[PDB]
Design a protein around this ligand. Structure first.
Ligand SMILES: COc1cc(N2CCC(N3CCN(C)CC3)CC2)ccc1Nc1ncc(Cl)c(Nc2ccccc2P(C)(C)=O)n1
Length: 321
């Protein structure tokens, strides 16, 4: 928390990438699917372009600072920023959307092996963020993106906060935060730690184990803190053995120091990933398959471009400016 942050902020020309379609709009702004072509390089990189006004440019550049400071296979990569009227965040395109939408659409072909492996990767990413003293404050299935069915990464650092040295927690001021993923101490006292991210990790796992069910469905956020304070929690999903449900309940304990560490969640879920049918009970588990075409034909349909001979995923484009 005291070392100098010598990350490179890369400025990209607007001319060298093309918007193609709207992937989504909302409170976060708008996200476009696009192709980035660094002139000189015989390369086409599939990218996602996020736009959020003086107040907007500050918040965008705060997220850019955070994303430019992380480099992990299970955290999403910031490729650079573009200095238009409103600043654009250029990020790596995750061609399969959010893990929440993925498990909802493919609920009938998702096996226990995939579910448990996603839990490992998400915990690997969150453990890396803890190593960097970064509290995400918005971990949820909607903020886990699918590069391939076997590879997911964490996104949306709009609420992320770097804990300065000798600061063990972040105290927020007001703001709109998703109540149903927040730890109780965050709801009541606006205190955020890496252990409050663990609470959100448990809700995220619950989202996956229910194939994308909404937590506390049909209950107003007004009543969430009242529910948890009385000792009520999310129910045991049908496919979950007590082994898996016990891990979720440990993430939702009142004492934040009694919750597991992301380190330990990696170990536990990786152990279960070696005998998946012993911990998740899914009918037809042995006959499930999820397609991940890395063919050059796959990108021609995704990017709506006939020629994709030079397509390079952002994870293979490491060439500096
Ligand atoms: C193909 O690429 C995508 C498509 C969708 N679509 C397609 C599926 C989905 N639908 C749903 C229902 N349908 C029936 C069937 C599948 C709808 C969304 C969504 C996301 C990405 N990738 C992507 N990479 C990087 C970013 Cl950085 C990003 N960011 C992003 C994109 C869109 C929304 C939110 C974000 P966030 C969390 C705030 O970054 N998004």
């Amino acid at each position: 928390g005291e070392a100098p942050n010598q990350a490179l902020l890369r400025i990209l020309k607007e001319t060298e990438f093309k918007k193609i379609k709207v992937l989504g709009s909302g409170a976060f702004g708008t996200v476009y699917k696009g192709l980035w072509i660094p002139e000189g390089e015989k390369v086409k990189i599939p990218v996602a372009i996020k736009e959020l006004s003086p107040k907007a440019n500050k918040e965008i550049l705060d997220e850019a600072y955070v994303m430019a400071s992380v480099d992990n296979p299970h955290v999403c990569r910031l490729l650079g920023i573009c200095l238009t009227s409103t600043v654009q965040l250029i990020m790596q395109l995750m061609p399969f959307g959010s893990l929440l939408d993925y498990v909802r659409e493919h609920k009938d072909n998702i096996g226990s092996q995939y579910l448990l492996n996603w839990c490992v990767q998400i915990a690997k990413g969150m453990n890396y963020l803890e190593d960097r003293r970064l509290v995400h404050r918005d971990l949820a299935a909607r903020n886990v993106l699918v590069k391939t069915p076997q590879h997911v990464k964490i996104t949306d650092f709009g609420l992320a906060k770097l804990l300065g040295a000798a600061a063990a927690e972040y105290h927020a001021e007001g703001g709109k935060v998703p109540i149903k993923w927040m730890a109780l101490e965050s709801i009541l006292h606006r205190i955020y730690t890496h252990q409050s991210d663990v609470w959100s990790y448990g809700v995220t796992v619950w989202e996956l184990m229910t194939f994308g069910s909404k937590p506390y469905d049909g209950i107003p956020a007004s009543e969430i803190s009242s529910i948890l304070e009385k000792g009520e929690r999310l129910p045991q999903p049908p496919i979950c053995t007590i082994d898996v449900y016990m891990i979720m309940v440990k993430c939702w304990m009142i004492d934040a120091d009694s919750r597991p560490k992301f380190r330990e969640l990696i170990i536990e879920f990786s152990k279960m990933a070696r005998d998946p049918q012993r911990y998740l009970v899914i009918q037809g588990d042995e006959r499930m398959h999820l397609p991940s075409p890395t063919d050059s034909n796959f990108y021609r349909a995704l990017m709506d471009e006939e020629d994709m001979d030079d397509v390079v995923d952002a994870d293979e484009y490491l060439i500096p400016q």
